[PDB]
Design a protein around this nucleic acid. Structure first.
Ligand SMILES: [Ca+2]
Ligand SMILES: [Ca+2]
Lengths: 266, 1072
DNA sequence: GCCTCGCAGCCGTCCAACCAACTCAA
DNA sequence: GAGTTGGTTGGACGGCTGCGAGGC
């Protein structure tokens, strides 16, 4: 068979379907980046950076050889490679393969699809097959390192923070962590406060509560982005030891999607 | 006394409307040099030439132009005792006029002619030339038109019992006519006799008695044929007196050599006295048809004269860049070039330039003509448009050129001149042809037609659009294509500037006008259009003027009329063949029926007179043996076979084809001059034979028979299917082919054998010969075609092997591209070069086609595409070999993005039709460039001419300069009309060309051809062609900078493989 | 009280139908 | 004066955001 092969069926396929179910149409136009670690999916929503890592551990079979590969999700500017994972696209779906063949930088990905039929038997849904050659060259910029602070918020709490965020550049939003774990988010009007502690509606759990900080965002798309992505509770991850500080919000529901927002001024 | 009939052309004039440009008043102040003078001047029309001056209408010794006229205004200018003896003369045209014995009573005509026109009668005038170059008119008396009516129907309707009754009934219908336009008609204006004839329609039709009625005038006949007994069918009422003269005298022709001879009672032709001349001839005769014979042997054309002319016009209104309209007094004719040739020697004899205002031809031009051995131009200068137009018409009357040519002369030059003379100046035109008054001189619109009595008008635009296939038929393009001459040009735009500048600059307009006429003369003597037109005139039995301006029907009608009369007839007055588109690299043999529709008519004996619509008409005959039965348009039709009754159409076609074969047998053993005449003759027979089927199919035409036309197509369709079924059944296996044609053993190629019809259209089929080599297939094809012809079809039906393709692309019905075994590429129904496209796309589109046909790697790979549905190629890698085809598209894409390019390769262009404020839609690309030039560049924008432009990529500077509010006196993503830019600006600032615009146009050009490789699906074709291009992805420059300052690491290019890999390991660890 | 479910409105993308514009003859 | 093409108007399909309010 192919030198590079990825397979989903049964429990692993149900895992990926559950991961895409809340994401709806938000990832259909995107960059797929593939290597020995897994598939990293990249997009920008309202100008903000968005990532979905799929680890090799989440596939029925995952086998890779040779360099990293990158593919744009759109085929012939119409159909998306990621369509198969939308919540109701193929109701009878049973198994999915990616086969990647050839020599860099001219490898081709072929995606194949199987559905359930009489007596539960698999049939290849051959009309739906997609083929895409890798990008001849590409550059993508990715997060790296460990965040200075991490805080976990529920389905409530996170929706309170999003509502407390300023509506526009006319009113910037401050995120702050004060003495004795007093997490707060506020602007010229709205304010919310929580009690952070190390790893009850006011309580928050985090990895590094001692590191006090205060940071601003002043063109804040994040209430648009995180509701577009339907994030049902997540981890706020702060990068503070950096010329442009950043907030990465990672979802903690069925979806492990992350969005990264640049902060100000520090 | 003066002339018997008044001369209506101007021989004297002493007042006229003086119209002239005020700019010719070269001493007037700058305020008063615009527009035209327009008023009435009491002066004789003047002409100036070389410092001398003359009256335009004075005839005498010192004239500025040549003459071939004997009479002028009723004065005889022939030398004393001028009296040529005429034996032989050539006829080029035939007039038809009415003369009255009362009008001609002062002329000293013999009684036998006066009898033929008492009280009125039709005279046939033969126009011609003697071997000594004398202009002749021979007036033939005694020809009468006639028509038929059924005797039983007339006797039962009008209660007639003898022919004299019918004569009085007709006289009554004319006496009682509205307005009494036929006052004084009598039974003596008629003759009627009883004759037996058959209606030409239907086989069952019995002979019957008819009244043959003779008449003295076509005016009377054309009233009787619709105003008198409309319920009673009439026969041959539409036949003109010229046709009766030609058909009723065996051997007579409308173009050719004649001899005068003694008639029945030893009567001779009478020479007219000068004051009885009806025309501008040197000698005229009265005769009857028995005074004439065809002169055998004589065949050389005599010294007829050709005028090649061209007008130049200047608009005089509020915009001199508007196209001139003759009905506007201020839109003048300013110059007329007029070249006079001998039509027999082809020599240029005179070069005349008529000029409104003074005009000094360049010494350069005079030297060029002298070096070429051509006549020195004579420049005729006039103070006003009327004096110039009068002088030109005076030349046309006095020199009397028998043939007239030019480029667009029927559609522009004559209509403009004659509109001026009629509408502005009120001049009567009826005396300016060959007749001295009451002749036809008329233009009318369909584009246009012209009739001028005694003048054969042949416009070279019609000749060349019929003969040569070209992108453009401007005289410039034709001169480059046909003559290979790179001639200069003066746009109407430059004309008004040159005209105002002075006599030297009006001389440059004159040079250009003369050079235009010299090129048209060269076209005329290359194609020799008078020789093909006269060959058709001789064959069809009609005059040369009708050959040019009447349609195809009258040619067949007149030949049928001659034959029908000899036979006793009278004429009454009125999906399996579809192409599976794709590419073949096995050889394809083309079988073609020689003259399919004429040969069906002959083989099946189809005619008006062999047709029956009724079974009882053929009950005495045996089916199949004595007649064809055929279902046509749902009706059952019967056609009796040639031994029962021979078809008139079949006899015409057979006799013409025998004549054509005989002529073409003589061509190889004939002189270089004879071979030209014989070639024109064989070509005339082909055009007439091909028109027979069409003649039967014109509903409401002359003598229609839709049953015959529909039968011809029905038989033709069945013959293709029969040929197909025979080929498929006879040569299904290689052993069967080899048993018929033993050289097939040498032809056998690798792979499976088959023969299948892949395409068929009207008279041709294409047979794919899988598993054979191309080399022998033309020779075996001749034997296949011969075998099929003898197996299936009656002579003269003949299938022929036309050609063998080695490679063929079937695109659609009547659309394909192929390569013939002799290496030549052939294209049908497709244009690979587009007028509106830049050079880059035309050249690259043609390179993709050349590659498909001339790299066997790509040809073989393209042929493999047919093995799978078009949709299936979306989901699997394309064949091995098309990678060389993809490389052309990759190189083309690269060649747009390359910075070192010649921007000229990508230039589009358009002309402003009017001043930019007057446009309805402001987004038209070339308008953007006008405003960008005048505002952003602050340069002078080009005035009402061709703007060149290119399409640029959207950037800053472009987004800013789109705020062109100076146009009065969408911004996120610009439109193509906004992205238009000036090429000089684009070069100077190194501006990037729009990759999406040019490459999407290149794919748009490519897909229209390569659709055939992918089941005609344009979306699949375009999608698969995009996939060859290398896709790349990067974040925007600003975004990349921000993310690097946010500590993001780079994955992909610009780093080693392990750096990219380890960076992804970091990315998955952070995003956990 | 508050999580989540459906309806009603807005937007982008798309195919279709239509229009005004060249090009030409001096 | 008849064929092509870049732009405008229009309705429909599909998917998302915001409001109201049913079930727990
Ligand atoms: Ca002309
Ligand atoms: Ca002209």
């Amino acid at each position: 068979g192919a030198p590079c092969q990825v397979v989903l069926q049964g429990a692993e396929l149900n895992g990926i379907l559950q991961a895409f179910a809340p994401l709806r149409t938000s990832l259909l136009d995107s960059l797929l980046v593939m290597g020995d670690r897994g598939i990293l999916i990249h997009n920008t929503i309202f100008g903000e950076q968005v990532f979905l890592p799929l680890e090799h551990s989440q596939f029925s079979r995952y086998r890779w050889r040779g360099p990293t590969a990158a593919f744009l999700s759109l085929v012939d500017q119409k159909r998306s490679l990621l369509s198969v994972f939308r919540a109701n696209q193929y109701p009878d779906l049973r198994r999915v393969e990616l086969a990647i063949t050839g020599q860099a930088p001219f490898r081709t990905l072929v995606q194949r699809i199987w559905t359930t039929t009489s007596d539960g038997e698999a049939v290849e849904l051959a009309s739906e097959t997609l083929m895409k050659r890798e990008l001849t060259s590409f550059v993508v910029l990715v997060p790296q390192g460990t965040p200075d602070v991490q805080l976990r918020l529920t389905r409530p709490q996170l929706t309170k923070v999003l509502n407390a965020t300023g509506a526009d550049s006319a009113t910037p939003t401050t995120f702050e962590l004060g003495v004795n774990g007093k997490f707060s988010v506020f602007t010229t009007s709205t304010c919310v406060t929580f009690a952070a502690r190390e790893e009850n509606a006011k309580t928050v759990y985090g990895e590094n509560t001692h590191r006090t900080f205060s940071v601003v965002v002043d063109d804040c798309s994040m209430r648009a982005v995180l509701r577009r992505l339907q994030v049902g509770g997540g981890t706020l991850k702060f990068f503070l030891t950096t010329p442009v500080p950043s907030l990465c919000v990672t979802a903690t529901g069925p979806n492990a999607v992350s969005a990264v927002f640049l902060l100000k001024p520090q | 006394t003066g002339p018997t009939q008044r001369h209506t052309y101007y021989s004297e004039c002493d007042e006229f409307r003086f119209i002239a440009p005020r700019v010719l008043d070269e001493d007037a102040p700058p305020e008063k040099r615009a527009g035209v003078h327009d008023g009435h001047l009491k002066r004789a029309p003047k002409v100036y030439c070389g410092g001398d001056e003359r009256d335009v209408l004075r005839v005498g010794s010192g004239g500025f132009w040549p003459r071939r006229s004997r009479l002028w205004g009723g004065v005889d200018h022939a030398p004393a005792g001028f009296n040529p003896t005429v034996t032989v003369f050539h006829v080029y045209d035939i007039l038809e006029n009415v003369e009255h014995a009362y009008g001609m009573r002062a002329a000293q005509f013999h009684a036998r002619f006066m009898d033929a026109i008492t009280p009125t009668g039709t005279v046939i005038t033969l126009l011609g030339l003697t071997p000594e170059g004398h202009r002749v008119a021979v007036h033939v008396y005694g020809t009468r038109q006639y028509f038929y009516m059924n005797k039983e129907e007339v006797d039962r309707h009008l209660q007639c019992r003898a022919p004299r009754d019918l004569c009085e009934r007709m006289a009554a219908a004319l006496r009682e006519s509205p307005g009494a336009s036929f006052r004084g008609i009598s039974a003596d204006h008629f003759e009627a006799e009883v004759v037996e004839r058959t209606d030409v329609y239907y086989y069952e039709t019995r002979p019957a008695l008819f009244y043959r009625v003779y008449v003295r005038s076509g005016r009377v006949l054309s009233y009787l044929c619709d105003n008198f007994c409309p319920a009673i069918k009439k026969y041959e009422g539409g036949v003109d007196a010229t046709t009766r003269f030609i058909l009723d005298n065996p051997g007579f022709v409308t173009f050719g050599w004649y001899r005068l001879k003694p008639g029945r009672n030893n009567t001779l032709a009478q020479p007219r006295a000068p004051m009885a001349f009806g025309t501008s001839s040197d000698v005229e005769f009265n005769c009857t048809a028995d005074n004439l014979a065809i002169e055998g042997g004589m065949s050389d054309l005599p010294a007829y004269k050709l005028m090649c002319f061209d007008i130049e016009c200047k608009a005089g209104g509020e915009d001199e860049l508007a196209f001139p309209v003759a009905g506007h007094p201020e839109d003048l004719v300013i110059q007329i070039s007029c070249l006079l040739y001998d039509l027999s020697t082809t020599a240029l004899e005179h070069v005349l330039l008529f000029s409104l205002g003074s005009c000094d031809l360049p010494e350069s031009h005079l030297n060029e003509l002298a070096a070429r051995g051509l006549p020195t131009p004579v420049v005729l200068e006039f103070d006003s448009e009327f004096e110039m137009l009068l002088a030109f018409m005076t030349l046309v009357k006095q020199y009397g050129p028998e043939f007239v040519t030019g480029y667009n002369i029927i559609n522009f030059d004559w209509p403009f001149l004659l509109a001026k003379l009629t509408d502005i100046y009120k001049v009567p035109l009826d005396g300016y042809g060959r007749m001295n008054g009451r002749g036809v001189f008329r233009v009318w619109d369909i584009r246009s037609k012209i009739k001028v009595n005694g003048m054969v008008n042949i416009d070279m635009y019609g000749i060349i659009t019929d003969k040569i296939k070209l992108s453009s038929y401007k005289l410039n393009a034709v001169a480059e294509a046909v003559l290979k001459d790179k001639k200069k040009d003066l746009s109407y735009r430059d004309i008004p500037a040159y005209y105002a500048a002075g006599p030297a600059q009006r001389g440059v307009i004159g040079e250009y006008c003369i050079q235009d006429s010299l090129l048209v003369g060269q076209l005329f003597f290359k194609f020799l259009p008078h020789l093909e037109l006269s060959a058709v005139a001789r064959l069809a039995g009609i005059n040369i003027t009708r050959t040019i301006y009447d349609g195809q029907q009258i040619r067949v009608f007149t030949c049928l009329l001659r034959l029908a009369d000899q036979k006793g007839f009278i004429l009454p007055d009125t999906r399996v063949l579809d192409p599976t588109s794709g590419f073949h690299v096995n050889p394809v043999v083309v079988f073609d029926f020689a003259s399919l529709y004429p040969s069906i008519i002959q083989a099946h004996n189809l005619c008006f007179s062999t047709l029956s619509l009724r079974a009882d008409a053929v009950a005495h005959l045996e089916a199949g043996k004595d007649y064809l039965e055929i279902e046509v348009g749902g009706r059952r039709l019967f056609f009796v076979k040639a031994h029962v009754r021979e078809s008139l159409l079949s006899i015409l076609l057979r006799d013409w084809l025998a004549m054509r074969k005989q002529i073409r047998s003589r061509i190889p053993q004939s002189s270089p001059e004879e071979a030209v005449l014989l070639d024109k003759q064989q070509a005339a027979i082909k055009v007439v034979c091909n028109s027979v089927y069409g003649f039967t199919g014109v509903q409401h035409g002359l003598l229609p028979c839709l049953h015959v036309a529909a039968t011809v197509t029905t038989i033709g369709r069945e013959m293709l299917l029969a040929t197909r079924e025979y080929v498929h059944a006879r040569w299904a296996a290689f052993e069967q082919l080899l048993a018929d044609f033993p050289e097939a053993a040498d032809m056998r190629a690798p792979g499976p054998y088959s023969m299948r019809i892949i395409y068929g259209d009207t008279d041709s089929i294409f047979v794919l010969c899988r598993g054979l080599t191309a080399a022998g297939l033309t020779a075996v094809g001749d034997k296949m075609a011969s075998h099929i012809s003898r197996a299936l079809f009656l002579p003269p039906i003949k299938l022929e092997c036309e050609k063998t393709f080695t490679k063929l692309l079937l695109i659609a019905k009547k659309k394909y591209i192929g390569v013939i075994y002799g290496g030549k590429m052939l294209i049908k129904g497709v244009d690979l070069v587009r007028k509106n496209n830049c050079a880059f796309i035309n050249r690259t589109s043609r390179a993709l086609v050349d590659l498909l046909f001339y790299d066997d790697t790509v040809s073989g790979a393209a042929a493999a595409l047919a093995e799978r549905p078009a949709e299936e190629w979306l989901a699997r890698p394309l064949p091995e070999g098309l990678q060389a085809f993809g490389a052309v598209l990759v190189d083309a894409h690269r060649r747009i993005t390359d910075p070192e390019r010649d921007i000229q390769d990508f230039v589009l262009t358009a002309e402003l039709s009017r001043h930019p404020r007057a446009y309805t839609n402001k987004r038209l690309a070339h308008l953007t460039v006008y405003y960008k030039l005048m505002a952003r560049r602050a340069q002078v924008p080009s005035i009402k001419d061709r703007i060149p432009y290119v399409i640029v990529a959207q950037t800053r500077e472009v987004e800013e300069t789109v705020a062109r509010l100076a146009a009065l006196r969408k911004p996120r993503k610009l439109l193509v009309s906004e992205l238009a830019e000036d090429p000089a600006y684009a070069i100077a600032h190194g501006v990037a060309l729009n990759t999406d615009y040019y490459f999407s146009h290149l794919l748009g050009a490519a897909c229209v051809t390569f659709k055939a490789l992918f089941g005609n699906n344009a979306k699949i074709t375009e999608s698969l062609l995009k996939r060859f291009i290398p896709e790349v992805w990067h974040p925007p420059d600003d975004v990349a900078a921000r993310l690097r300052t946010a500590g993001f690491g780079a994955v992909g290019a610009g780093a080693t493989a392990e750096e990219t890999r380890r960076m992804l390991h970091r990315a998955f660890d952070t995003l956990a």
